[PDB]
Coordinates of N, CA and C in Angstrom, one line a residue:
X148 N 1.3 -1.8 0.0 CA -0.3 0.1 0.5 C 1.0 1.6 0.2
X149 N 0.7 2.4 -0.6 CA 1.3 3.3 -1.3 C 0.2 4.7 -0.2
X150 N 1.3 4.9 1.0 CA -0.3 5.8 1.5 C 0.0 7.2 1.2
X151 N -1.0 8.2 1.1 CA -1.0 9.8 1.3 C 0.0 10.0 0.9
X152 N 1.3 10.2 1.9 CA 2.0 10.9 2.6 C 3.6 8.9 3.1
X153 N 3.9 9.6 2.0 CA 5.6 8.6 2.2 C 6.6 9.4 2.0
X154 N 8.0 8.2 2.9 CA 8.6 8.7 2.6 C 10.2 7.9 1.7
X155 N 11.1 8.3 1.8 CA 11.9 7.3 0.4 C 13.5 7.6 1.5
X156 N 14.2 6.4 0.8 CA 15.8 7.2 1.4 C 16.4 6.7 -0.2
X157 N 17.1 7.2 -0.5 CA 17.5 6.7 -1.9 C 19.7 6.6 -1.6
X158 N 20.2 6.4 -2.6 CA 21.7 5.8 -2.4 C 22.1 6.6 -4.1
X159 N 23.0 7.0 -4.8 CA 23.3 7.3 -5.5 C 24.7 7.3 -5.7
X160 N 25.7 6.0 -6.7 CA 26.9 6.6 -6.9 C 27.4 5.9 -8.5
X161 N 28.1 7.1 -8.8 CA 28.0 8.0 -10.2 C 29.6 8.3 -10.2
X162 N 30.2 8.2 -11.5 CA 31.2 8.8 -12.3 C 31.0 9.6 -13.3
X163 N 31.9 10.6 -13.3 CA 31.1 11.7 -14.0 C 32.3 12.3 -14.0
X164 N 32.9 12.4 -16.2 CA 34.7 12.6 -16.4 C 35.2 11.9 -15.7
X165 N 35.6 10.8 -15.3 CA 36.6 9.9 -14.5 C 36.3 9.8 -12.4
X166 N 35.7 11.1 -12.5 CA 34.9 11.4 -11.5 C 34.2 10.5 -10.4
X167 N 34.5 10.1 -9.5 CA 33.8 8.8 -8.8 C 33.1 10.2 -7.2
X168 N 32.0 9.7 -7.0 CA 31.4 9.6 -5.8 C 30.2 9.1 -5.2
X169 N 29.2 9.3 -4.0 CA 28.1 9.1 -3.7 C 27.7 10.0 -3.0
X170 N 26.1 9.7 -2.8 CA 25.2 10.6 -2.2 C 24.4 9.8 -1.9
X171 N 24.0 10.2 -0.7 CA 22.5 9.9 0.4 C 21.5 11.1 0.4
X172 N 20.7 10.4 0.3 CA 19.5 11.1 0.6 C 18.0 10.9 1.8
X173 N 17.1 11.7 2.2 CA 16.1 11.4 2.2 C 15.5 12.0 1.4
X174 N 13.6 11.3 1.1 CA 12.8 13.4 1.2 C 11.1 12.1 1.7
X175 N 10.4 13.4 1.6 CA 9.0 12.8 1.5 C 8.0 13.6 0.6
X176 N 6.9 13.0 0.7 CA 5.4 13.4 -0.8 C 4.6 12.8 -0.4
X177 N 3.9 13.3 -1.1 CA 2.3 13.1 -0.9 C 2.2 12.2 -3.3
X178 N 2.3 10.7 -2.6 CA 2.0 10.1 -4.4 C 0.6 10.2 -5.6
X179 N 0.0 10.7 -4.3 CA -1.3 10.7 -5.2 C -1.9 11.9 -5.7
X180 N -1.1 13.4 -5.3 CA -1.2 14.7 -5.4 C 0.6 14.5 -6.6
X181 N 0.6 14.2 -6.1 CA 2.2 14.2 -7.0 C 3.1 15.5 -6.9
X182 N 3.5 15.4 -4.9 CA 4.5 16.5 -5.2 C 5.3 15.8 -4.3
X183 N 6.6 16.4 -4.3 CA 8.1 15.8 -3.0 C 8.6 16.9 -3.0
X184 N 9.2 16.5 -2.1 CA 10.9 17.2 -1.5 C 11.8 16.1 -1.2
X185 N 13.1 16.3 -1.5 CA 14.5 15.8 -1.1 C 16.0 16.3 -0.1
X186 N 16.3 16.1 0.4 CA 17.8 17.1 0.9 C 18.6 15.1 0.6
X187 N 19.3 16.1 -0.4 CA 20.8 15.1 -0.9 C 22.0 15.5 -0.2
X188 N 23.0 14.6 0.5 CA 24.0 15.4 0.8 C 25.5 14.5 0.1
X189 N 26.4 15.1 -0.6 CA 27.3 14.4 -1.3 C 28.2 13.6 0.2
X190 N 28.3 12.3 0.0 CA 29.2 11.8 1.0 C 30.1 11.5 1.0
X191 N 30.4 11.0 -0.8 CA 32.1 10.6 -0.9 C 32.2 11.2 -2.5
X192 N 33.6 11.9 -3.2 CA 33.7 12.4 -3.6 C 33.7 14.0 -3.8
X193 N 33.8 14.5 -2.7 CA 32.7 15.9 -2.4 C 34.5 16.8 -2.6
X194 N 33.8 18.3 -3.1 CA 32.8 18.6 -3.7 C 32.4 18.3 -5.4
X195 N 31.9 18.3 -5.7 CA 31.6 17.8 -7.2 C 32.5 18.9 -7.9
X196 N 32.8 18.8 -9.2 CA 33.4 19.8 -9.4 C 32.8 19.6 -11.0
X197 N 31.1 19.4 -11.4 CA 30.3 19.7 -12.6 C 29.0 20.1 -11.8
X198 N 28.5 20.1 -12.8 CA 27.5 20.9 -12.2 C 26.1 19.7 -11.6
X199 N 25.2 20.2 -10.5 CA 24.4 19.6 -10.0 C 22.9 19.2 -10.9
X200 N 23.4 20.1 -12.0 CA 21.8 19.9 -12.7 C 21.8 18.9 -13.5
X201 N 22.7 17.6 -13.7 CA 23.0 16.8 -14.7 C 22.2 16.0 -13.2
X202 N 22.5 15.6 -12.0 CA 22.5 14.9 -11.4 C 21.0 15.0 -10.8
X203 N 20.5 16.3 -11.0 CA 19.3 16.2 -9.9 C 17.6 15.5 -10.5
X204 N 17.9 15.5 -11.5 CA 16.5 14.3 -12.4 C 16.5 12.9 -12.0
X205 N 17.7 12.4 -11.2 CA 18.1 11.2 -11.6 C 17.5 11.0 -9.9
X206 N 17.2 12.0 -9.2 CA 16.8 12.0 -7.7 C 15.4 12.2 -7.6
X207 N 11.7 9.5 -8.9 CA 10.8 9.4 -8.5 C 9.2 9.2 -8.9
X208 N 8.8 8.2 -9.7 CA 8.1 8.1 -10.6 C 7.0 7.5 -10.0
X209 N 7.2 6.9 -9.1 CA 5.9 6.6 -7.9 C 5.6 8.0 -7.0
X210 N 5.4 9.3 -7.4 CA 5.8 10.6 -7.1 C 4.3 10.9 -8.1
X211 N 3.4 10.6 -8.5 CA 2.8 11.4 -10.2 C 1.8 10.8 -10.0
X212 N 1.0 12.6 -10.2 CA -0.7 12.9 -9.8 C -1.0 12.4 -11.2
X213 N -1.5 11.1 -11.1 CA -2.3 10.4 -12.4 C -4.3 10.3 -12.7
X214 N -4.5 11.1 -13.2 CA -6.2 11.0 -13.5 C -6.4 9.2 -13.4
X215 N -7.3 9.0 -12.7 CA -8.2 7.7 -12.6 C -8.8 7.2 -13.8
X216 N -8.6 6.9 -15.2 CA -8.7 6.4 -15.5 C -7.4 5.9 -16.2
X217 N -5.7 6.5 -16.3 CA -4.5 5.9 -16.6 C -4.2 5.3 -15.6
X218 N -4.0 4.1 -15.7 CA -3.4 2.7 -15.0 C -2.0 3.2 -14.8
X219 N -1.8 3.6 -13.3 CA -0.5 3.7 -12.1 C 0.1 2.9 -12.7
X220 N 1.0 2.4 -13.8 CA 1.7 1.4 -13.8 C 3.0 1.4 -12.7
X221 N 3.6 2.5 -12.5 CA 4.7 2.0 -11.4 C 4.5 2.3 -10.2
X222 N 3.3 2.7 -9.4 CA 1.8 2.1 -8.2 C 1.8 0.8 -8.1
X223 N 1.5 0.7 -9.3 CA 1.2 -1.0 -9.9 C 2.1 -2.0 -8.9
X224 N 2.7 -0.8 -9.1 CA 3.6 -2.6 -9.7 C 4.7 -3.1 -7.7
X225 N 4.1 -2.4 -7.1 CA 4.4 -2.4 -5.0 C 4.1 -3.6 -5.6
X226 N 4.3 -4.1 -3.8 CA 5.4 -4.1 -3.0 C 6.6 -3.6 -3.6
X227 N 7.0 -5.2 -4.9 CA 8.2 -5.6 -5.1 C 9.1 -4.0 -6.6
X228 N 8.1 -3.4 -6.7 CA 8.8 -2.2 -6.8 C 8.9 -2.6 -8.6
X229 N 10.1 -1.4 -9.2 CA 10.6 -1.0 -11.0 C 11.5 -1.0 -10.3
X230 N 11.9 -1.0 -11.9 CA 13.6 -0.6 -12.9 C 13.8 0.5 -13.5
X231 N 14.3 1.3 -13.6 CA 14.3 1.7 -14.8 C 15.7 2.4 -14.8
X232 N 16.3 2.9 -16.3 CA 17.3 2.7 -17.1 C 16.8 3.6 -18.4
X233 N 18.4 4.9 -18.3 CA 17.7 6.2 -19.2 C 19.5 6.7 -19.3
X234 N 19.0 7.3 -21.0 CA 20.2 7.7 -21.5 C 19.9 9.2 -21.8
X235 N 20.9 10.3 -21.5 CA 20.4 11.6 -22.1 C 21.6 12.0 -23.0
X236 N 21.7 12.6 -23.9 CA 22.2 12.6 -25.2 C 22.2 14.5 -24.8
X237 N 23.6 15.4 -24.6 CA 24.2 16.8 -25.0 C 24.1 16.8 -25.6
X238 N 23.3 18.0 -26.4 CA 23.7 18.5 -27.9 C 25.2 18.4 -28.1
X239 N 26.8 18.9 -26.5 CA 27.6 18.8 -27.0 C 28.6 17.5 -27.1
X240 N 27.7 17.1 -27.0 CA 28.7 15.5 -27.3 C 28.7 14.5 -26.0
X241 N 28.7 15.2 -24.4 CA 27.8 14.0 -23.5 C 26.8 13.6 -23.3
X242 N 27.0 12.8 -22.7 CA 26.8 11.4 -22.6 C 25.9 10.8 -20.8
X243 N 24.9 10.6 -20.4 CA 24.7 9.9 -19.4 C 23.4 9.3 -19.0
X244 N 24.0 8.3 -18.5 CA 23.1 6.9 -18.2 C 23.5 6.6 -17.4
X245 N 22.1 6.1 -16.8 CA 22.0 5.5 -15.6 C 21.1 5.2 -15.5
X246 N 21.0 3.6 -13.8 CA 20.0 2.8 -14.3 C 19.2 2.5 -12.2
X247 N 18.7 2.6 -12.3 CA 18.5 2.0 -10.9 C 17.0 1.5 -10.5
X248 N 17.0 1.7 -9.3 CA 15.8 0.2 -8.9 C 15.4 0.7 -7.7
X249 N 13.9 0.7 -8.2 CA 13.0 1.3 -6.4 C 12.4 -0.2 -6.0
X250 N 12.1 0.0 -4.7 CA 11.5 -0.7 -3.4 C 11.0 -0.2 -2.5
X251 N 9.9 -1.1 -1.9 CA 8.9 -1.1 -0.8 C 9.7 -1.4 0.4
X252 N 10.0 -0.7 1.8 CA 10.3 -1.8 3.0 C 10.3 -0.7 4.3
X253 N 9.9 -1.7 4.8 CA 9.3 -1.4 6.2 C 8.4 0.7 6.2
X254 N 6.9 0.5 4.8 CA 6.7 1.9 4.5 C 7.0 2.5 3.8
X255 N 8.7 2.3 3.4 CA 9.3 3.6 2.7 C 9.7 2.9 1.5
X256 N 10.0 4.0 0.3 CA 10.5 3.5 -1.1 C 11.9 3.4 -0.4
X257 N 13.1 3.0 -1.0 CA 14.7 2.7 -1.3 C 15.0 2.9 -2.4
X258 N 15.7 3.9 -3.0 CA 16.2 3.7 -3.9 C 17.6 3.5 -4.2
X259 N 18.0 2.9 -5.5 CA 19.5 2.6 -5.6 C 19.8 3.3 -6.8
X260 N 20.6 3.9 -6.7 CA 21.0 4.8 -8.1 C 22.0 4.4 -8.9
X261 N 22.7 4.1 -9.9 CA 23.9 4.6 -10.8 C 24.6 5.3 -11.9
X262 N 24.8 5.7 -11.7 CA 24.5 7.5 -13.2 C 26.7 7.3 -14.2
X263 N 27.0 7.1 -14.8 CA 28.0 7.6 -15.8 C 27.7 8.7 -16.3
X264 N 28.9 9.2 -16.1 CA 28.6 10.7 -17.5 C 30.0 11.3 -18.3
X265 N 29.5 10.8 -19.3 CA 31.0 10.3 -19.9 C 30.7 12.3 -21.0
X266 N 32.4 11.9 -22.1 CA 32.2 12.1 -23.3 C 31.7 14.2 -22.7
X267 N 32.0 15.0 -21.4 CA 31.6 16.0 -21.4 C 33.2 17.1 -21.7
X268 N 32.9 17.9 -22.9 CA 34.1 18.6 -22.6 C 34.3 19.4 -21.4
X269 N 35.5 19.7 -21.6 CA 36.7 20.1 -20.5 C 36.3 21.7 -20.1
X270 N 35.6 22.7 -20.8 CA 35.1 24.3 -21.1 C 33.6 24.2 -20.9
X271 N 33.1 23.5 -21.4 CA 31.2 23.0 -21.7 C 30.1 23.2 -20.0
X272 N 29.4 24.4 -20.5 CA 28.5 23.8 -19.3 C 28.9 23.3 -18.2
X273 N 28.1 22.5 -18.0 CA 28.2 20.8 -17.3 C 30.1 21.7 -15.9
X274 N 31.1 20.7 -17.3 CA 32.5 21.1 -16.3 C 32.9 22.2 -15.8
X275 N 31.6 23.9 -16.4 CA 32.3 25.2 -16.0 C 31.1 25.3 -15.2
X276 N 30.1 24.5 -14.3 CA 29.3 24.4 -13.7 C 28.2 25.4 -13.6
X277 N 28.1 25.8 -15.1 CA 27.3 27.2 -15.9 C 26.0 27.2 -15.9
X278 N 25.5 25.8 -15.6 CA 24.0 25.9 -15.3 C 22.9 26.7 -14.5
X279 N 21.8 26.9 -14.7 CA 21.0 27.0 -13.2 C 19.6 26.9 -13.7
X280 N 19.6 25.1 -13.0 CA 18.1 24.6 -12.9 C 17.3 24.0 -14.0
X281 N 16.5 23.6 -14.1 CA 15.4 23.1 -15.2 C 14.8 23.9 -16.2
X282 N 13.6 24.2 -17.2 CA 12.1 24.8 -17.8 C 12.0 23.5 -17.4
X283 N 10.3 24.0 -17.1 CA 9.4 23.0 -17.0 C 9.4 22.3 -18.2
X284 N 9.2 20.7 -18.1 CA 8.9 20.3 -19.3 C 7.6 18.7 -19.2
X285 N 7.5 18.2 -20.4 CA 6.6 16.9 -20.7 C 7.6 16.1 -20.8
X286 N 7.3 14.8 -19.9 CA 7.6 13.6 -20.5 C 6.1 12.9 -21.2
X287 N 7.1 12.3 -23.0 CA 6.3 12.2 -23.8 C 6.2 10.9 -22.7
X288 N 4.8 9.7 -22.5 CA 5.4 7.8 -21.7 C 4.6 7.9 -23.0
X289 N 4.8 6.4 -23.2 CA 4.5 5.4 -24.1 C 4.9 4.5 -23.9
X290 N 4.0 2.9 -24.7 CA 4.3 1.4 -23.6 C 5.6 1.0 -25.0
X291 N 6.3 0.4 -24.4 CA 7.0 -0.4 -26.1 C 8.1 -1.5 -24.9
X292 N 8.3 -2.4 -25.7 CA 9.0 -3.7 -25.1 C 8.7 -4.4 -24.1
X293 N 7.2 -4.4 -23.4 CA 6.9 -4.9 -23.1 C 6.8 -4.3 -21.4
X294 N 7.3 -2.8 -21.7 CA 7.7 -2.1 -20.9 C 7.3 -0.5 -20.9
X295 N 7.2 0.7 -20.0 CA 6.8 2.0 -19.9 C 8.4 2.7 -20.4
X296 N 7.8 3.5 -21.3 CA 9.0 4.1 -22.3 C 8.6 5.7 -21.9
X297 N 9.2 6.8 -21.9 CA 9.4 8.7 -21.2 C 10.4 8.6 -22.3
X298 N 10.2 10.2 -22.6 CA 11.0 11.1 -24.1 C 11.1 12.3 -22.9
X299 N 11.8 13.0 -23.0 CA 11.8 14.2 -22.9 C 13.2 15.3 -23.3
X300 N 12.9 16.2 -23.7 CA 14.0 17.3 -24.4 C 14.4 18.3 -22.8
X301 N 15.0 17.9 -22.3 CA 14.9 19.2 -20.9 C 16.6 20.2 -21.7
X302 N 15.8 20.7 -21.2 CA 16.5 22.4 -21.1 C 17.0 22.6 -19.9
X303 N 18.3 23.1 -19.8 CA 19.4 23.2 -19.0 C 19.2 24.7 -19.2
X304 N 19.1 25.8 -17.9 CA 18.7 27.5 -18.4 C 20.2 27.5 -18.0
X305 N 20.8 28.5 -18.6 CA 22.4 29.0 -18.3 C 22.8 30.8 -17.9
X306 N 23.6 30.5 -17.2 CA 24.3 31.7 -16.2 C 24.1 32.7 -17.1
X307 N 25.2 32.9 -17.8 CA 24.9 34.6 -19.0 C 24.2 33.9 -20.6
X308 N 23.1 33.4 -20.1 CA 21.7 33.1 -21.1 C 22.1 32.0 -22.4
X309 N 20.6 31.7 -23.0 CA 20.9 31.3 -23.1 C 20.5 29.3 -22.8
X310 N 20.9 28.2 -23.7 CA 19.5 27.1 -23.2 C 21.5 25.8 -23.3
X311 N 21.1 24.6 -22.9 CA 22.0 24.0 -23.0 C 20.7 22.2 -22.8
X312 N 20.6 21.5 -23.9 CA 19.6 20.9 -24.2 C 19.9 19.2 -23.7
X313 N 19.3 18.4 -23.6 CA 19.6 16.9 -23.6 C 18.5 16.5 -24.0
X314 N 18.2 14.8 -25.0 CA 17.3 14.2 -25.7 C 17.7 13.4 -24.8
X315 N 15.9 12.7 -23.6 CA 16.8 11.9 -22.4 C 15.5 10.9 -22.9
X316 N 15.9 9.8 -22.9 CA 15.0 8.6 -23.6 C 14.8 7.6 -22.3
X317 N 13.6 7.2 -21.5 CA 14.0 6.3 -20.3 C 13.3 5.1 -20.5
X318 N 13.6 4.1 -20.1 CA 12.1 2.5 -19.9 C 12.2 2.7 -18.5
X319 N 10.5 2.6 -17.8 CA 11.4 1.6 -16.4 C 9.9 0.3 -16.6
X320 N 10.8 -0.7 -15.9 CA 9.9 -1.6 -15.6 C 9.6 -2.0 -15.0
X321 N 8.3 -2.8 -14.4 CA 7.9 -3.3 -13.3 C 8.7 -4.9 -12.8
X322 N 9.2 -5.1 -11.4 CA 9.7 -6.1 -11.2 C 8.6 -7.6 -11.5
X323 N 7.3 -7.3 -11.4 CA 6.3 -7.9 -12.2 C 5.4 -7.6 -12.6
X324 N 5.0 -8.5 -13.6 CA 4.3 -7.9 -14.4 C 2.7 -8.0 -14.8
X325 N 2.4 -5.8 -14.4 CA 1.4 -4.9 -14.4 C 1.1 -4.6 -15.7
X326 N -0.4 -3.9 -15.4 CA -1.1 -3.2 -16.9 C -0.6 -2.0 -17.4
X327 N -0.1 -2.4 -18.8 CA 0.4 -1.1 -19.5 C -0.1 -0.1 -19.2
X328 N -0.6 1.7 -19.4 CA -1.3 2.0 -20.2 C -0.9 2.4 -21.1
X329 N -1.7 3.2 -22.2 CA -1.5 3.7 -23.2 C -0.7 5.6 -23.1
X330 N -0.1 6.0 -24.3 CA -0.1 6.7 -24.1 C -0.8 8.2 -23.7
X331 N 0.2 8.5 -23.3 CA -0.3 10.0 -22.4 C 1.0 11.2 -21.8
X332 N 1.2 12.2 -21.4 CA 2.1 13.5 -21.3 C 2.0 13.1 -19.5
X333 N 3.3 13.3 -19.1 CA 3.7 14.1 -17.4 C 4.7 15.0 -17.3
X334 N 3.6 16.1 -17.1 CA 4.1 17.3 -17.0 C 4.6 17.2 -15.5
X335 N 5.9 18.5 -15.4 CA 7.0 18.4 -13.8 C 7.8 19.6 -14.1
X336 N 7.8 19.9 -13.4 CA 8.4 21.6 -12.3 C 8.9 20.5 -11.5
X337 N 10.7 20.7 -11.1 CA 11.9 20.8 -10.5 C 12.8 21.9 -10.6
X338 N 12.5 21.3 -8.9 CA 13.1 23.3 -8.6 C 14.2 23.2 -7.4
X339 N 15.7 23.7 -7.6 CA 17.0 23.4 -6.5 C 16.2 24.5 -5.4
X340 N 15.3 23.8 -4.5 CA 14.8 24.8 -3.2 C 16.2 25.5 -2.4
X341 N 17.3 24.9 -1.9 CA 18.5 25.7 -1.0 C 19.4 24.5 -1.8
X342 N 20.5 25.5 -1.8 CA 22.1 24.4 -1.7 C 23.0 25.5 -1.1
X343 N 24.1 25.0 -0.5 CA 25.3 25.4 0.3 C 26.2 25.9 -1.4
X344 N 26.9 26.4 0.2 CA 28.2 26.6 -1.8 C 29.0 26.1 -2.3
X345 N 29.3 24.9 -2.0 CA 30.1 23.6 -3.0 C 29.4 22.7 -3.1
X346 N 27.5 22.9 -3.5 CA 27.0 22.1 -4.1 C 26.5 20.7 -3.1
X347 N 27.0 19.9 -1.5 CA 27.5 19.3 -1.1 C 26.5 18.5 -0.6
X348 N 25.3 19.8 0.2 CA 23.6 20.0 0.5 C 22.6 20.0 -0.3
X349 N 21.3 19.3 -0.9 CA 21.0 20.6 -1.7 C 19.3 20.1 -1.4
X350 N 19.1 20.9 -1.7 CA 17.6 20.7 -0.8 C 16.6 20.7 -2.6
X351 N 15.9 20.1 -3.1 CA 14.8 19.6 -4.0 C 13.9 19.6 -3.9
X352 N 12.4 20.3 -4.9 CA 11.2 19.7 -5.5 C 11.1 19.5 -6.5
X353 N 9.7 18.7 -6.4 CA 9.0 18.7 -8.1 C 7.6 18.5 -7.6
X354 N 7.3 18.9 -8.5 CA 5.6 18.7 -9.0 C 5.5 17.7 -10.4
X355 N 4.8 17.2 -10.0 CA 4.4 16.1 -11.2 C 3.5 15.2 -11.5
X356 N 2.4 15.9 -12.4 CA 1.1 15.3 -13.1 C 0.7 14.7 -14.7
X357 N 0.3 13.5 -14.2 CA 0.2 13.1 -15.7 C -1.5 13.6 -16.7
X358 N -1.5 14.1 -17.3 CA -2.4 13.9 -18.3 C -2.5 13.1 -20.0
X359 N -3.6 13.2 -20.4 CA -4.1 12.6 -21.6 C -3.4 12.6 -22.8
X360 N -3.2 12.4 -24.0 CA -2.5 12.6 -25.0 C -2.4 13.0 -25.5

């Protein structure tokens, strides 16, 4: 059972341009209202020498508000949970891959994340930490390969004007077989509500809701 109020714990192990790091985080939110907050701490490899914005979207699809007629594939996957794999192709060649495992333990969600950050130019917006958060987007959701897929055109604002884009592709698969929905949209807004000077402590807020195609 997914209650109206739910907490989660997350751990992320990753590598960006050969720099290894680990992140721990805890958060809470309203799974049916589609809102959540998270506080993340860099526990190893801190301070990170690249943009926090490449990581922010990797820190929770069970917290999506869904209309009653769209099956909630990821909520229906519980208690066993689900997994997801993502690819983010940045405009300058930079690539980020993520694998995730989500489960339920003692009434709380547990997230395990693994991240690869490859071929980012040393003078680019990520390496130079020139990003300023992301704009509100819409993930096009659709079934494919006995799984739910999602597509986003992520836009990161830059400090001195303009944007830095990525084509994001994700596959979400329930551990046990559950009813796949038809295509729909998931509108999101993710905000960095607070951070310390070196980004070793970061607070995030996100709202997500499902709408008919």
